């Protein structure tokens, strides 16, 4: 059972294999998996229910396998369309910004997002 | 920088991708003022 | 809390501190290593997530 | 004569071989304890695995030991 | 004569030392199996073939060692 | 003559080396016990007999080394 929920949408909140990018690297959850808490990093997420796979671009969040086999994924913005150039333009601007200013951390997040997007 | 502030910034960045909706834009644009208060006086309103 | 669609009952709930995570037997029901500061991260994350729900 | 001395010595050398198996047995049991403590519930799957792993680790020790006996006797 | 016959019995003994490594090795593969399957209890069907393979290969190094021991023992 | 008595003593000394691996082994099983009990807070009742079992088997390997040492020593 997968519970994948966002503030403004609710997705999978059964599912067979879920592939997650986590503080602990990358984690895949299949059936019984020991109950965990993981911070989800800004991510490309794949959720597979049977052979069907849906691919989500995710702003990071939290993942918590519950001991009752409920994979609580909470994230702010997760689909395929979310990945679907402008971000590269933005990163250039944001990089210039790092020179003066928290904004540095923002731009760092942007490098991660651009790379993560580029990965798709 | 709180962890969820970090995640927040990532979420805002993520709608920059080409495909967009108003509710998303609203989720990426809001304003407020956090105002301090004393044990009385209110240090000057500073935009959130 | 909007109790019924014609009523509202003012409601409160307790946000759980990082201490709570620490001294709860949540090691016995979940698994983290120690490298992550899951109390300091989960506290922050649910500080907002709980507040957002309350706001809604 | 020299050969009879050499037999007794040779047997002794073979006894050294057992040390590796001993470490091996321990490694399997350590993993068992870690696994059991990790899941609270892996135990029924893991218990035959542990027995198999023990047996194979032990087997290497046994080979060393029989070579010792063979050299000892003849 | 005595020197050569003795040498076979000594040399056989020396060969036996190599086996310790394989003994430790087998256990290391099994340890990973137990821990791995514990961490994801459903990985087993993929992993168990891999485990037996790793066992066999580690064991094989031990076998080559043991062969040289027996060759000196009985030749 | 002298050589045969000498050889018995030498072979005994060499056999004593075998025990060391068992020594380290016993510790490893107990290390896992400690880590397990600290990990679970509550595993102890199942795991304690497991720890004893693992101890015994590891110990037995050293025992074999020891009896061979005596066997060569005494003849």
Ordered by start, the domain boundaries in chain B are: 1-48
Q: In whole angstroms, what is the distance from residue C34 CA to residue A33 CA?
A: 19
CB distance A76 to A50 below 8 Å? no
Name beta bridge partners: B43. none
Chain D neighbors of F7, CB-CB under 8 A: 5-6, 8-9
A65: CB partners within 8 A, 6+ apart? A29, A33, A34, A35, A36, A71, A72, C30
What's chain E's Rg over C-alpha atoms?
18
Give the separation between CA E73 and CA C52, rounded to whole angstroms: 78
Can you tell me the distance from the alpha carbon of F41 to that of A55, in angstroms, rounded to the nearest whole number? 39
> Who's near A115: CB < 8 A, 6+ residues apart?
none
Residue from D32, D19, D28 nearest D61 by CA? D19
CB-CB contact of A1 with A71 (8 Å)? yes
**Rg for chain A (alpha carbons), in Å?**
16
C19, D61, D44: which is closest to E20 by C-alpha?
D61
- For A63, phi and psi rounded to 5 degrees? -130, 140
The distance of B39 to chain A (nearest Cα, Å) reads 30
Q: What is the DSSP secondary-structure string of B6-35?
A: HHHHHHHHHT------HHHHHTT----EE-
Contact A8 B27 (CB under 8 A): yes
Q: Do residues D49 and D3 lie in contact, with contact meaning Cβ atoms separated by under 8 Å? A: no
Place of tokens 């892996």: D42
Residues after which chain C is discontinuous, using a C–N cutoff of 2.5 Å: none
Burial class (CB in 10 A: 0-12, 13-18, 19+), A40: buried
Question: Residue D6: which residues within 8 A CB-CB, separation 6 or more?
Answer: E5, E6, E7, E9, E10, F7
Evaluate whether D32 touches F42 at the Cβ level (below 8 Å). no
In the block, which residue shows the tokens 């514990």? E38
In angstroms, the CA A4 to CA E62 distance is: 50
Task: Identify the CATH number of the domain defined by range B1-48.
Answer: 1.10.1620.20
* Topology at the third CATH level for domain E2-75: F1FO ATP Synthase (1.20.20)
Sign of CA dihedral E31, E33, E38, E40: positive
User: How far is residue F63's CA from residue D62's CA, in Å, rounded to a whole number?
Assistant: 13
Helices (H), chain E: 2-16, 19-39, 44-73
CA E74, F2, F8, F14 torsion: positive or negative?
negative
Which residues are CB-contacts of A63 (< 8 A; sequence separation ≥ 6)? A20, A22, A27, A36, A37, A38, A39, A40, A71, A72, A73
Q: State residue B3 phi and psi, 5-degree precision.
A: -60, -40
Residues paired with residue A37 on neighbouring β-strands, in sequence order: A64
- A1-84 folds as ATP Synthase; domain 1 (2.60.15)
CA distances from D67 to D60, E5, E72 (A): 11, 17, 11
How many CB atoms sit inside 10 A of residue F48's CB?
14
C-alpha A22/C-alpha A28 separation (Å) is 10
Q: Do chains C and B touch by CB distance (3+ pairs < 8 Å)?
A: yes
Q: Are E30 and D29 in contact (CB under 8 A)?
A: no
Three-state DSSP string of chain C: CCCECCECCCCCCCCCCHHHHHHCCCCCCCCCCCCCCHHHHHHHHHHHHHHHHHHC
Using a CB-CB distance cutoff of 8 angstroms, which residues of chain E are in contact with residue A34?
38-41
Q: What is the resolution of this structure in A?
A: 4.4
**Cα torsion for A51, A52, A55, A61, to the nearest 10°?**
-80
Cβ D28 vs Cβ E29: under 8 Å: no
Contacts of D28 (CB under 8 A, 6+ apart): D50, D53, D54, D57, E27, E30, E31, E34, F54
Q: Say yes or no for a CB contact (<8 Å) between A105 and B3.
A: no
Q: Do E51 and E26 touch, CB atoms closer than 8 A?
A: no
Which of B2, B5, B12, B16 to mutate to probe the A interface, most A CBs <10 Å?
B16
DSSP state of C7: B
Helix (H, G, I), strand (E, B) or coil at C36: coil
Give helix F2-16 / helix F44-74 axis angle, nearest 10°: 170
Interface of B with C in 2-41 (CB under 8 A): 2-4, 7
Q: Where are the alpha helices (DSSP H) in F1-75?
A: 2-16, 19-39, 44-74
- Give the C-alpha separation, D43 to D51, whole Å: 12
First to last CA, chain B: 14
| Experimental approach | cryo-EM
Tokens 């879920």 sit at which residue?
Answer: A18
CB nearest D46 (choices: E27, E38, E70):
E38
Q: Determine the distance in angstroms separating the CA of A30 from the nearest CA of chain E, rounded to an integer.
A: 7
Residue carrying structure tokens 């795991």: F47
**What does DSSP say about strands A2-5 and A71-75: parallel, antiparallel, or unpaired?**
parallel
> Per the CB < 8 Å rule, is A32 touching E43?
no
For residues A55 and D67, give the distance between their C-alpha atoms in angstroms, rounded to a whole number: 59
Long-range pairs of A86-90 with CB within 8 A, sequence gap ≥ 24: A86/B16, A86/B17, A86/B18, A87/A113, A87/A114, A87/A117, A87/B13, A87/B16, A87/B17, A88/A114, A90/B13, A90/B16
The tokens for E75 are 């030749």
Residue appearing with tokens 């992993």: E47
Radius of gyration of chain F (CA): 18
Per-residue exposure over E28-51, b if at least 16 CB sit within 10 Å of its own CB, e if not = bbbbebbbbbbbbbebbeebeeeb
Cβ atoms of F22 and F65 closer than 8 Å: yes
- Quote the minimal CA–CA distance from C10 to chain B in Å: 24
Using CB atoms within 10 Å of the CB of residue C7, give its burial: 0 to 12 exposed, 13 to 18 middle, 19+ buried: exposed
Q: Cβ contacts (< 8 Å) between F11 and chain D: which residues? A: 8-9, 11-12
Nearest CA among D51, D49, A67, D40 for reference residue F44 = D40
> Could you tell me if F66 lies within 8 Å of chain D, comparing CB atoms?
no
Taking alpha carbons only, the member of F49, F2, B10 closest to residue F10 is F2
CATH 2.60.15.10 in chain A, residues? 1-84
Residue D12 and residue F10: Cα distance in Å, rounded?
Answer: 8
- Inter-chain contact D61–F62, Cβ cutoff 8 Å? no
| Domain D1-74: assigned CATH number | 1.20.20.10
**Cα C29 off chain centre by:** 16
């Amino acid at each position: 059972k997968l519970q994948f929920a966002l503030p403004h949408e609710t997705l999978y909140s059964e599912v067979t294999q879920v592939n997650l990018p986590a503080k602990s690297g990358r984690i895949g959850v299949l059936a019984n998996h020991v109950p965990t808490v993981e911070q989800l990093l800004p991510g490309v997420v794949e959720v597979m229910e049977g052979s069907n796979s849906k691919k989500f671009f995710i702003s990071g969040g939290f993942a918590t396998v519950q001991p009752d086999s409920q994979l609580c994924v909470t994230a702010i913005e997760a689909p395929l369309e979310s990945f679907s150039e402008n971000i590269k333009n933005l990163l250039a601007e944001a990089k210039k910004n790092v020179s003066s200013s928290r904004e540095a951390a923002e731009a760092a997040i942007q490098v991660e997002v651009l790379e993560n997007l580029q990965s798709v | 920088i709180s962890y969820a502030a970090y995640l927040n910034v990532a979420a805002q960045a993520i709608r920059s991708t080409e495909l967009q909706t108003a509710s998303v834009l609203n989720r990426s644009q809001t304003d407020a003022f956090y105002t301090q208060y004393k044990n009385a006086s209110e240090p000057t309103p500073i935009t959130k | 809390d909007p109790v019924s669609s014609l009523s509202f009952e003012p409601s409160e709930k307790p946000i759980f501190n990082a201490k709570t995570i620490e001294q709860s037997p949540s090691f016995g029901k979940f698994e983290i290593d120690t490298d992550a500061n899951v109390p300091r991260d989960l506290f922050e994350y649910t500080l907002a997530n709980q507040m957002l729900t309350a706001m809604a | 004569q020299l050969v009879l001395a050499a037999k007794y010595i040779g047997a002794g050398i073979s006894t050294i071989g057992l040390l590796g198996a001993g470490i091996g047995i321990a490694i399997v049991f350590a993993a068992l304890i870690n696994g059991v403590s990790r899941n609270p519930s892996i135990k029924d799957t893991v218990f035959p695995m542990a027995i198999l792993g023990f047996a194979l680790s032990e087997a290497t020790g046994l080979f060393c030991l029989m070579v010792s006996f063979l050299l000892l006797f003849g």
